[PDB]
mmCIF file of C-alpha atoms in Angstrom:
data_model
loop_
_atom_site.group_PDB
_atom_site.id
_atom_site.type_symbol
_atom_site.label_atom_id
_atom_site.label_comp_id
_atom_site.label_asym_id
_atom_site.label_seq_id
_atom_site.Cartn_x
_atom_site.Cartn_y
_atom_site.Cartn_z
ATOM 1 C CA UNK A 5 80.200 82.072 70.256
ATOM 2 C CA UNK A 6 78.274 82.652 73.484
ATOM 3 C CA UNK A 7 76.888 79.563 75.452
ATOM 4 C CA UNK A 8 73.483 78.258 74.818
ATOM 5 C CA UNK A 9 72.082 79.768 78.078
ATOM 6 C CA UNK A 10 73.235 83.145 77.306
ATOM 7 C CA UNK A 11 71.625 82.936 73.675
ATOM 8 C CA UNK A 12 68.441 81.946 75.466
ATOM 9 C CA UNK A 13 68.807 85.029 77.851
ATOM 10 C CA UNK A 14 69.140 87.527 74.774
ATOM 11 C CA UNK A 15 66.235 85.817 73.021
ATOM 12 C CA UNK A 16 64.257 86.397 75.991
ATOM 13 C CA UNK A 17 65.434 89.994 76.651
ATOM 14 C CA UNK A 18 64.927 90.866 72.818
ATOM 15 C CA UNK A 19 61.198 89.749 72.913
ATOM 16 C CA UNK A 20 60.742 91.794 76.272
ATOM 17 C CA UNK A 21 62.356 94.783 74.820
ATOM 18 C CA UNK A 22 60.597 94.870 71.819
ATOM 19 C CA UNK A 23 57.096 94.289 73.509
ATOM 20 C CA UNK A 24 56.844 91.214 71.412
ATOM 21 C CA UNK A 25 54.401 88.918 73.758
ATOM 22 C CA UNK A 26 53.491 86.239 71.224
ATOM 23 C CA UNK A 27 57.581 85.577 71.314
ATOM 24 C CA UNK A 28 57.949 86.405 75.020
ATOM 25 C CA UNK A 29 54.883 83.848 76.027
ATOM 26 C CA UNK A 30 56.846 80.977 74.707
ATOM 27 C CA UNK A 31 59.454 81.302 77.709
ATOM 28 C CA UNK A 32 56.816 81.399 80.409
ATOM 29 C CA UNK A 33 54.880 78.565 82.063
ATOM 30 C CA UNK A 34 52.342 78.944 84.836
ATOM 31 C CA UNK A 35 54.903 78.787 87.466
ATOM 32 C CA UNK A 36 57.419 81.564 86.043
ATOM 33 C CA UNK A 37 58.286 84.239 88.581
ATOM 34 C CA UNK A 38 59.011 87.716 87.614
ATOM 35 C CA UNK A 39 60.477 89.319 90.816
ATOM 36 C CA UNK A 40 61.795 92.890 91.246
ATOM 37 C CA UNK A 41 63.555 92.687 94.329
ATOM 38 C CA UNK A 42 64.319 96.074 94.650
ATOM 39 C CA UNK A 43 60.437 97.035 94.483
ATOM 40 C CA UNK A 44 59.352 93.920 96.266
ATOM 41 C CA UNK A 45 56.886 93.123 93.568
ATOM 42 C CA UNK A 46 56.364 89.590 91.882
ATOM 43 C CA UNK A 47 54.014 88.652 88.891
ATOM 44 C CA UNK A 48 53.288 84.748 88.535
ATOM 45 C CA UNK A 49 52.605 82.868 85.394
ATOM 46 C CA UNK A 50 52.318 83.737 81.733
ATOM 47 C CA UNK A 51 49.032 85.446 82.052
ATOM 48 C CA UNK A 52 49.843 87.591 85.049
ATOM 49 C CA UNK A 53 53.364 88.692 83.574
ATOM 50 C CA UNK A 54 52.241 89.464 80.349
ATOM 51 C CA UNK A 55 49.355 91.586 81.512
ATOM 52 C CA UNK A 56 51.768 93.374 83.750
ATOM 53 C CA UNK A 57 53.892 94.059 80.793
ATOM 54 C CA UNK A 58 51.108 95.204 78.545
ATOM 55 C CA UNK A 59 49.969 97.834 81.111
ATOM 56 C CA UNK A 60 53.513 99.234 82.075
ATOM 57 C CA UNK A 61 54.651 99.367 78.329
ATOM 58 C CA UNK A 62 51.674 100.545 76.703
ATOM 59 C CA UNK A 63 52.399 103.714 74.386
ATOM 60 C CA UNK A 64 56.289 103.381 75.204
ATOM 61 C CA UNK A 65 58.292 104.888 72.442
ATOM 62 C CA UNK A 66 61.771 103.328 73.233
ATOM 63 C CA UNK A 67 62.602 100.367 75.475
ATOM 64 C CA UNK A 68 66.108 98.628 75.583
ATOM 65 C CA UNK A 69 68.323 96.948 77.908
ATOM 66 C CA UNK A 70 71.883 98.024 77.505
ATOM 67 C CA UNK A 71 74.065 95.105 78.510
ATOM 68 C CA UNK A 72 77.661 96.157 79.715
ATOM 69 C CA UNK A 73 78.525 92.545 80.659
ATOM 70 C CA UNK A 74 76.749 89.218 80.911
ATOM 71 C CA UNK A 75 77.682 85.829 82.393
ATOM 72 C CA UNK A 76 76.176 82.369 83.281
ATOM 73 C CA UNK A 77 76.815 79.582 85.670
ATOM 74 C CA UNK A 78 74.715 76.819 83.968
ATOM 75 C CA UNK A 79 71.103 78.035 83.649
ATOM 76 C CA UNK A 80 71.630 81.034 85.778
ATOM 77 C CA UNK A 81 72.395 84.062 83.518
ATOM 78 C CA UNK A 82 73.491 87.297 84.977
ATOM 79 C CA UNK A 83 73.396 90.773 83.052
ATOM 80 C CA UNK A 84 74.623 94.111 84.303
ATOM 81 C CA UNK A 85 73.634 97.264 82.523
ATOM 82 C CA UNK A 86 71.094 99.836 82.133
ATOM 83 C CA UNK A 87 67.568 100.112 81.097
ATOM 84 C CA UNK A 88 66.504 103.243 78.831
ATOM 85 C CA UNK A 89 63.152 103.950 78.561
ATOM 86 C CA UNK A 90 61.153 106.757 76.691
ATOM 87 C CA UNK A 91 57.408 107.475 76.681
ATOM 88 C CA UNK A 92 54.290 109.241 77.925
ATOM 89 C CA UNK A 93 55.089 110.247 81.469
ATOM 90 C CA UNK A 94 51.474 109.942 82.988
ATOM 91 C CA UNK A 95 52.702 106.606 84.881
ATOM 92 C CA UNK A 96 55.689 108.288 86.252
ATOM 93 C CA UNK A 97 53.881 111.319 87.621
ATOM 94 C CA UNK A 98 54.522 113.385 84.724
ATOM 95 C CA UNK A 99 51.514 113.800 82.417
ATOM 96 C CA UNK A 100 51.634 115.895 79.261
ATOM 97 C CA UNK A 101 55.424 114.995 78.658
ATOM 98 C CA UNK A 102 57.601 112.408 77.061
ATOM 99 C CA UNK A 103 59.992 111.085 79.738
ATOM 100 C CA UNK A 104 63.311 109.748 79.197
ATOM 101 C CA UNK A 105 65.162 107.910 81.695
ATOM 102 C CA UNK A 106 68.285 105.505 81.803
ATOM 103 C CA UNK A 107 68.118 103.033 84.931
ATOM 104 C CA UNK A 108 71.179 100.934 86.115
ATOM 105 C CA UNK A 109 70.159 97.646 86.812
ATOM 106 C CA UNK A 110 71.221 93.908 87.240
ATOM 107 C CA UNK A 111 68.816 91.281 86.007
ATOM 108 C CA UNK A 112 69.328 87.502 86.357
ATOM 109 C CA UNK A 113 67.346 84.813 84.402
ATOM 110 C CA UNK A 114 67.178 81.155 85.459
ATOM 111 C CA UNK A 115 65.728 78.934 82.600
ATOM 112 C CA UNK A 116 64.904 74.990 83.460
ATOM 113 C CA UNK A 117 67.607 73.545 81.176
ATOM 114 C CA UNK A 118 65.143 70.709 79.852
ATOM 115 C CA UNK A 119 62.167 72.931 78.726
ATOM 116 C CA UNK A 120 64.102 76.181 78.138
ATOM 117 C CA UNK A 121 61.280 78.106 80.042
ATOM 118 C CA UNK A 122 61.933 80.760 82.623
ATOM 119 C CA UNK A 123 62.037 79.434 86.287
ATOM 120 C CA UNK A 124 62.515 83.095 87.733
ATOM 121 C CA UNK A 125 63.649 86.561 86.569
ATOM 122 C CA UNK A 126 65.246 88.784 89.296
ATOM 123 C CA UNK A 127 65.502 92.332 88.702
ATOM 124 C CA UNK A 128 67.688 94.691 90.932
ATOM 125 C CA UNK A 129 66.876 98.384 89.574
ATOM 126 C CA UNK A 130 68.515 101.576 90.673
ATOM 127 C CA UNK A 131 65.128 103.462 91.395
ATOM 128 C CA UNK A 132 66.970 106.512 93.356
ATOM 129 C CA UNK A 133 68.773 107.224 89.951
ATOM 130 C CA UNK A 134 65.254 107.086 87.976
ATOM 131 C CA UNK A 135 63.725 109.409 90.789
ATOM 132 C CA UNK A 136 66.658 111.554 90.356
ATOM 133 C CA UNK A 137 66.285 111.846 86.750
ATOM 134 C CA UNK A 138 62.408 112.234 86.820
ATOM 135 C CA UNK A 139 62.631 115.251 89.241
ATOM 136 C CA UNK A 140 64.496 117.246 86.526
ATOM 137 C CA UNK A 141 61.793 116.489 83.938
ATOM 138 C CA UNK B 5 76.893 112.184 101.444
ATOM 139 C CA UNK B 6 75.871 108.371 100.910
ATOM 140 C CA UNK B 7 72.882 106.854 102.794
ATOM 141 C CA UNK B 8 73.655 105.064 105.960
ATOM 142 C CA UNK B 9 72.921 101.624 104.352
ATOM 143 C CA UNK B 10 75.611 102.333 101.489
ATOM 144 C CA UNK B 11 77.905 103.519 104.350
ATOM 145 C CA UNK B 12 77.437 100.206 106.221
ATOM 146 C CA UNK B 13 78.064 98.242 102.827
ATOM 147 C CA UNK B 14 81.265 99.990 102.286
ATOM 148 C CA UNK B 15 82.506 99.348 105.921
ATOM 149 C CA UNK B 16 81.500 95.708 105.746
ATOM 150 C CA UNK B 17 83.229 95.442 102.265
ATOM 151 C CA UNK B 18 86.472 97.263 103.780
ATOM 152 C CA UNK B 19 86.494 94.607 106.519
ATOM 153 C CA UNK B 20 86.186 91.645 104.428
ATOM 154 C CA UNK B 21 88.604 92.709 101.845
ATOM 155 C CA UNK B 22 91.276 93.530 104.419
ATOM 156 C CA UNK B 23 90.577 90.115 106.208
ATOM 157 C CA UNK B 24 89.945 92.364 109.446
ATOM 158 C CA UNK B 25 87.877 89.268 111.171
ATOM 159 C CA UNK B 26 87.553 91.434 114.334
ATOM 160 C CA UNK B 27 85.750 94.294 112.654
ATOM 161 C CA UNK B 28 83.845 92.102 110.094
ATOM 162 C CA UNK B 29 82.455 89.851 112.853
ATOM 163 C CA UNK B 30 80.691 92.846 114.340
ATOM 164 C CA UNK B 31 78.373 92.621 111.323
ATOM 165 C CA UNK B 32 77.322 89.101 112.038
ATOM 166 C CA UNK B 33 74.998 87.215 114.193
ATOM 167 C CA UNK B 34 73.755 83.482 114.769
ATOM 168 C CA UNK B 35 71.227 83.963 111.850
ATOM 169 C CA UNK B 36 73.287 86.003 109.331
ATOM 170 C CA UNK B 37 73.615 84.380 105.795
ATOM 171 C CA UNK B 38 76.310 84.321 103.152
ATOM 172 C CA UNK B 39 75.040 82.781 99.817
ATOM 173 C CA UNK B 40 77.223 82.436 96.674
ATOM 174 C CA UNK B 41 74.491 81.857 94.183
ATOM 175 C CA UNK B 42 76.783 81.207 91.502
ATOM 176 C CA UNK B 43 78.421 78.579 93.435
ATOM 177 C CA UNK B 44 75.267 76.825 95.092
ATOM 178 C CA UNK B 45 77.336 77.670 98.578
ATOM 179 C CA UNK B 46 75.515 78.721 101.806
ATOM 180 C CA UNK B 47 77.032 79.500 105.113
ATOM 181 C CA UNK B 48 75.030 80.499 108.341
ATOM 182 C CA UNK B 49 75.988 82.578 111.425
ATOM 183 C CA UNK B 50 79.180 84.176 112.528
ATOM 184 C CA UNK B 51 81.199 80.971 113.434
ATOM 185 C CA UNK B 52 80.437 79.141 110.069
ATOM 186 C CA UNK B 53 80.970 82.266 107.735
ATOM 187 C CA UNK B 54 84.359 83.408 109.587
ATOM 188 C CA UNK B 55 85.518 79.910 109.699
ATOM 189 C CA UNK B 56 84.651 79.640 105.686
ATOM 190 C CA UNK B 57 86.561 83.227 105.083
ATOM 191 C CA UNK B 58 89.599 82.259 107.078
ATOM 192 C CA UNK B 59 89.838 78.996 105.060
ATOM 193 C CA UNK B 60 89.228 80.685 101.809
ATOM 194 C CA UNK B 61 91.265 83.423 102.403
ATOM 195 C CA UNK B 62 94.362 81.888 104.101
ATOM 196 C CA UNK B 63 97.542 83.227 102.811
ATOM 197 C CA UNK B 64 96.068 85.705 100.047
ATOM 198 C CA UNK B 65 98.377 88.590 99.218
ATOM 199 C CA UNK B 66 96.077 90.849 97.606
ATOM 200 C CA UNK B 67 92.352 91.274 97.751
ATOM 201 C CA UNK B 68 89.926 93.901 96.961
ATOM 202 C CA UNK B 69 86.383 94.769 95.475
ATOM 203 C CA UNK B 70 86.660 97.621 92.998
ATOM 204 C CA UNK B 71 83.275 99.104 93.210
ATOM 205 C CA UNK B 72 82.003 100.559 89.917
ATOM 206 C CA UNK B 73 78.239 101.487 90.896
ATOM 207 C CA UNK B 74 76.408 101.118 94.222
ATOM 208 C CA UNK B 75 72.772 101.609 94.940
ATOM 209 C CA UNK B 76 70.127 100.654 97.557
ATOM 210 C CA UNK B 77 66.348 100.471 98.344
ATOM 211 C CA UNK B 78 66.165 100.632 101.908
ATOM 212 C CA UNK B 79 68.187 98.053 103.605
ATOM 213 C CA UNK B 80 69.390 96.372 100.494
ATOM 214 C CA UNK B 81 72.390 97.474 98.890
ATOM 215 C CA UNK B 82 73.370 96.559 95.278
ATOM 216 C CA UNK B 83 77.113 96.569 94.491
ATOM 217 C CA UNK B 84 78.521 96.313 91.140
ATOM 218 C CA UNK B 85 82.147 95.733 90.318
ATOM 219 C CA UNK B 86 85.092 93.583 90.006
ATOM 220 C CA UNK B 87 86.782 91.452 92.730
ATOM 221 C CA UNK B 88 90.668 91.155 92.752
ATOM 222 C CA UNK B 89 92.793 88.550 94.321
ATOM 223 C CA UNK B 90 96.162 87.398 94.160
ATOM 224 C CA UNK B 91 97.272 84.431 96.507
ATOM 225 C CA UNK B 92 97.870 80.576 96.830
ATOM 226 C CA UNK B 93 96.266 78.678 93.816
ATOM 227 C CA UNK B 94 95.468 75.267 95.402
ATOM 228 C CA UNK B 95 91.817 75.812 95.541
ATOM 229 C CA UNK B 96 91.683 77.219 91.960
ATOM 230 C CA UNK B 97 93.266 74.116 90.772
ATOM 231 C CA UNK B 98 96.864 75.423 90.465
ATOM 232 C CA UNK B 99 98.621 73.914 93.432
ATOM 233 C CA UNK B 100 102.056 75.519 94.447
ATOM 234 C CA UNK B 101 101.701 78.613 92.593
ATOM 235 C CA UNK B 102 100.450 82.192 93.275
ATOM 236 C CA UNK B 103 97.210 83.026 91.002
ATOM 237 C CA UNK B 104 96.103 86.554 90.174
ATOM 238 C CA UNK B 105 92.504 87.083 89.002
ATOM 239 C CA UNK B 106 89.947 90.158 88.511
ATOM 240 C CA UNK B 107 86.410 88.853 88.289
ATOM 241 C CA UNK B 108 83.278 90.582 87.590
ATOM 242 C CA UNK B 109 80.743 90.279 90.344
ATOM 243 C CA UNK B 110 77.460 91.734 91.642
ATOM 244 C CA UNK B 111 77.059 91.549 95.630
ATOM 245 C CA UNK B 112 73.816 92.547 97.672
ATOM 246 C CA UNK B 113 74.020 93.153 101.352
ATOM 247 C CA UNK B 114 70.917 93.377 103.279
ATOM 248 C CA UNK B 115 71.126 95.032 106.796
ATOM 249 C CA UNK B 116 68.782 95.124 109.872
ATOM 250 C CA UNK B 117 67.824 98.738 110.307
ATOM 251 C CA UNK B 118 67.267 98.246 114.067
ATOM 252 C CA UNK B 119 71.097 96.838 114.792
ATOM 253 C CA UNK B 120 73.179 97.507 111.742
ATOM 254 C CA UNK B 121 73.830 93.946 111.327
ATOM 255 C CA UNK B 122 74.151 91.707 108.338
ATOM 256 C CA UNK B 123 71.090 89.736 107.556
ATOM 257 C CA UNK B 124 72.045 88.394 104.115
ATOM 258 C CA UNK B 125 74.943 88.864 101.366
ATOM 259 C CA UNK B 126 74.477 87.513 98.271
ATOM 260 C CA UNK B 127 77.088 86.939 95.494
ATOM 261 C CA UNK B 128 76.631 86.480 91.789
ATOM 262 C CA UNK B 129 80.396 85.870 90.479
ATOM 263 C CA UNK B 130 81.703 85.465 86.881
ATOM 264 C CA UNK B 131 83.476 82.003 87.106
ATOM 265 C CA UNK B 132 83.989 81.514 83.533
ATOM 266 C CA UNK B 133 85.996 84.470 83.377
ATOM 267 C CA UNK B 134 88.102 83.420 86.229
ATOM 268 C CA UNK B 135 88.624 80.171 84.637
ATOM 269 C CA UNK B 136 89.651 81.982 81.334
ATOM 270 C CA UNK B 137 92.224 83.983 83.310
ATOM 271 C CA UNK B 138 93.477 80.976 85.051
ATOM 272 C CA UNK B 139 94.213 79.052 81.778
ATOM 273 C CA UNK B 140 97.404 81.438 81.268
ATOM 274 C CA UNK B 141 98.576 80.528 85.042
#
């Protein structure tokens, strides 16, 4: 019973968190922007975004976006929750360990309503909470 | 023991929600931006923003932002929560009545580290939930 724009957003998040790049790539064109505003990083276009997710998530054991609430205005979809990640810790400063983190965050997705491709994803992530958790591991 | 940027964010939200325009105007200058991304509305500068808030909140009986979680990376503060408003319903399509709503929203505030003034506020408000609440009013 969720609006179509919300079903689009869940499909996108399912592919991302399942590390399914064949499905995920269907949502991207050359002009898609993946922007983490909190980290001031941007990845642009199918090839660069996919390549970044491959490097980031290689070997990850668990990755989910636990959604507390979502809503939309037209093709802008807003999702509030937390990301949990479990995996080898090299890339988080913790070699030889499996890290486990639960990061509060807000993600927006804006789709082009005529192509159903992503125009912009914006992440706002609570990196201090991540740092605090990693210091104890 | 919150960082200074989160303290600024709380002072600003305190002034905004109390309708204390003298206190609130201390955060603004010629270039400050208020953007409601979910409403496609933008107001720039002290004069325009205060004029907009004064119009908007005229005769409002109760107003608050019940913050569930807040975090920041440097000058950018993210606040997740719920906006409660009780007041005249003309702007909300309920003329001659008092409406009472509780709206999930995410607000970001970016402050200038040199001056402590607001550079940009961005709102993401769940307007469909508002509309569903107004059905019974």
